[PDB]
Amino acid sequence: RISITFFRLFRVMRLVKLLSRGEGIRTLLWTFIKSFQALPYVALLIVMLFFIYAVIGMQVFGKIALNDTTEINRNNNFQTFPQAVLLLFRCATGEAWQDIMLACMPGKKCAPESEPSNSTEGETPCGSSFAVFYFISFYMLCAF
Amino acid sequence: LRVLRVLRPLRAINRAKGLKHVVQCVFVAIRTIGNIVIVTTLLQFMFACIGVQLFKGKLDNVLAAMMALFTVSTFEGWPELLYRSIDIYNYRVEISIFFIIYIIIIA
Amino acid sequence: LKNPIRRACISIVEWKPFEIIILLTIFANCVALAIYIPFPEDDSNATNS
Amino acid sequence: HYNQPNWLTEVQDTANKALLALFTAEMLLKMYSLGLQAYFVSLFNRFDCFVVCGGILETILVETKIMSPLGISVLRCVRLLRIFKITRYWNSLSNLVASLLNSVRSIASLLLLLFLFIIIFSLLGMQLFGGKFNFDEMQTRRSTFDNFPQSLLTVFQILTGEDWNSVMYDGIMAYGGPSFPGMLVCIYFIILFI
Amino acid sequence: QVVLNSIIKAMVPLLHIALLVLFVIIIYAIIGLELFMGKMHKTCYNQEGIADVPAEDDPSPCALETGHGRQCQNGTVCKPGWDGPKHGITNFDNFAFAMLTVFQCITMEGWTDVLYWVNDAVGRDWPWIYFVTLIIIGSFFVLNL
Amino acid sequence: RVYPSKQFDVLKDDYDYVLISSVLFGLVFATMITKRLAQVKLLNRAWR
């Protein structure tokens, strides 16, 4: 019974009871998880930073052109909000975000489905050559 | 410039006052940070001029090519540089160690 | 527990040059194990010999 | 500006020699206005005397022919040291460089210990595999354990944590295929990280 | 000698802290055994022992509810096999392999690869919470250390 | 090729380098140890 088999997890939850037997160390936990006094302010700052840097990418990186095996795929989808949050979180931790920066070029076509996207002039209507500095600033702010 | 209507948190987060001084100190030391960046860039300019005038002879810039490489060499990509270069070939590899020292200087 | 002569006359050999020679021996061993040209299985080319 | 002209480069030459005079007039004055043994012993201006003497000697040497000159490079480097005078003012960088100079004496032991540690681990890795990276394949693997320098750089790369997972997979697949006794290699990597 | 003694003495009072990681490195691993028990067995071997991919795409199963692993290569066969790890190592079966996988994920290196693999294998948006919790717990433990 | 007079000009091909190095190192070690022992004996005899 998937998604309801938490009771077996309850058994592994019994392993957490071992941490109780480490009373001498649980005080450390009592000073970390209960340290949520100045934590809410910085947490609100970081979540509002995520909000302002997430809603701003939707319109500027619209029609992300998800394609198989080109570093921008269905798993790398961006137009969906939760997946955009996932992508920005992946970029935040530094997991090969250089490839993400290199995946948005002025000469790269982004979903050639619109009517004025027939490549009559040989132009890809997708600049996106500003996310480098923006994501560098985001990384610096999150680290700070 | 479409949905810029999120000014409420700016007024709402003005209660703790434990980080406004932090922001003030950061934005008052940013001048010294920029001066240090400038002097490191001058050192990079010196080293690049020496290296490209003495080696790296063609068969970006003396003050910008190293920065452009650093954009992919933030300690995540310089090991990638070594990984790619492990295959000119051995002509002035010391730049990599220079890319160590400069980074070390930054580090 | 026995110190008529030998114990007294052997604890005296604690020279600084004694430790220097021991460190030199250790360094020589480290250098000897450094090259140790590997081979698939027992290739005696007068080096490992 | 990285250019290679000829009309102005010559103009760039002679003035340099004049700079030596501009970097000498104070010197003798500090040998005259101040005491002979007073100015010479400060641990800061003595470095300046050494720098200027080396610069003028290098200029005299490069006035003639020399193989692998490096004179222009070191002259420009000691011109960077002129900003050290600018560093004398606004001590916000002089204190930092003094701390950097101080810290090396303490950090020498730690760096020596780390170097010895990577040496022993590289030796152990070389012993364990010894060129067994056949993999039954032809493609050139980016790392191997056949020679000392390549093993050392592979150990350094594994310590940096860059693509170490694939290297560990290759190492375990070399001899110890997935099974009960084939994991003995894997733990060797894990410790080598932590 | 003094430096090494100081280094080894400094880490002793923190040893208990390290023990906690063991619990973590087990707990979430067990969760995977509940949710990813043999989920990589199904593959997309095109004709005979060769997947219908350029040796890079994950041959996700031809699920009854389509959406992942559609394998639309103009003629496909989905059969059980080992087309997951590059050497069949980090598969979630063989519990030691699950422990190795969770340890490789907890070091913040390449976890997105296995996240994409599992999302393609079982479906989208269901399991990312597990990896997010693992990564935030790892960050908190790094802070504690 | 033939050598009527047992090849007095070229060093023999069966030279043992390892034995020479070992005997030299042993001589040096013995010299050091004997020097230390003699010095300590003189010092102890001086102080009765």
Curated annotation (Swiss-Prot), chain A:
It is found in: Cell membrane; Cell membrane, Sarcolemma; Perikaryon; Postsynaptic density membrane. Residues 23-40 are cytoplasmic. A motif (Selectivity filter of repeat IV) lies at residues 93-96. Disulfide bonds join C110-C126. Elevated levels of blood glucose lead to increased phosphorylation by PKA. Detected throughout the brain, including hippocampus, cerebellum and amygdala, throughout the heart and vascular system, including ductus arteriosus, in urinary bladder, and in retina and sclera in the eye. Expressed in brain, heart, jejunum, ovary, pancreatic beta-cells and vascular smooth muscle. Overall expression is reduced in atherosclerotic vascular smooth muscle. Residues 62-83, 103-130 are extracellular. Pore-forming, alpha-1C subunit of the voltage-gated calcium channel that gives rise to L-type calcium currents. Mediates influx of calcium ions into the cytoplasm, and thereby triggers calcium release from the sarcoplasm. Plays an important role in excitation-contraction coupling in the heart. Required for normal heart development and normal regulation of heart rhythm. Required for normal contraction of smooth muscle cells in blood vessels and in the intestine. Essential for normal blood pressure regulation via its role in the contraction of arterial smooth muscle cells. It is linked to Timothy syndrome: Disorder characterized by multiorgan dysfunction including lethal arrhythmias, webbing of fingers and toes, congenital heart disease, immune deficiency, intermittent hypoglycemia, cognitive abnormalities and autism. Brugada syndrome 3: A heart disease characterized by the association of Brugada syndrome with shortened QT intervals. Brugada syndrome is a tachyarrhythmia characterized by right bundle branch block and ST segment elevation on an electrocardiogram (ECG). It can cause the ventricles to beat so fast that the blood is prevented from circulating efficiently in the body. When this situation occurs, the individual will faint and may die in a few minutes if the heart is not reset. Belongs to the calcium channel alpha-1 subunit (TC 1.A.1.11) family. CACNA1C subfamily. This is Voltage-dependent L-type calcium channel subunit alpha-1C. It comes from Homo sapiens.
Curated annotation (Swiss-Prot), chain F:
It is found in: Endoplasmic reticulum membrane. The chain crosses the membrane at residues 18-38. Residues 39-48 are cytoplasmic. Component of the ER membrane protein complex (EMC). Part of the endoplasmic reticulum membrane protein complex (EMC) that enables the energy-independent insertion into endoplasmic reticulum membranes of newly synthesized membrane proteins. Preferentially accommodates proteins with transmembrane domains that are weakly hydrophobic or contain destabilizing features such as charged and aromatic residues. Involved in the cotranslational insertion of multi-pass membrane proteins in which stop-transfer membrane-anchor sequences become ER membrane spanning helices. It is linked to Cerebellar atrophy, visual impairment, and psychomotor retardation: An autosomal recessive, neurodegenerative disorder characterized by developmental delay, intellectual disability, hypotonia, scoliosis, cerebellar atrophy, and variable dysmorphic features. Belongs to the EMC1 family. This is ER membrane protein complex subunit 1. It comes from Homo sapiens. The lineage of its organism: Eukaryota, Metazoa, Chordata, Craniata, Vertebrata. The gene is EMC1.
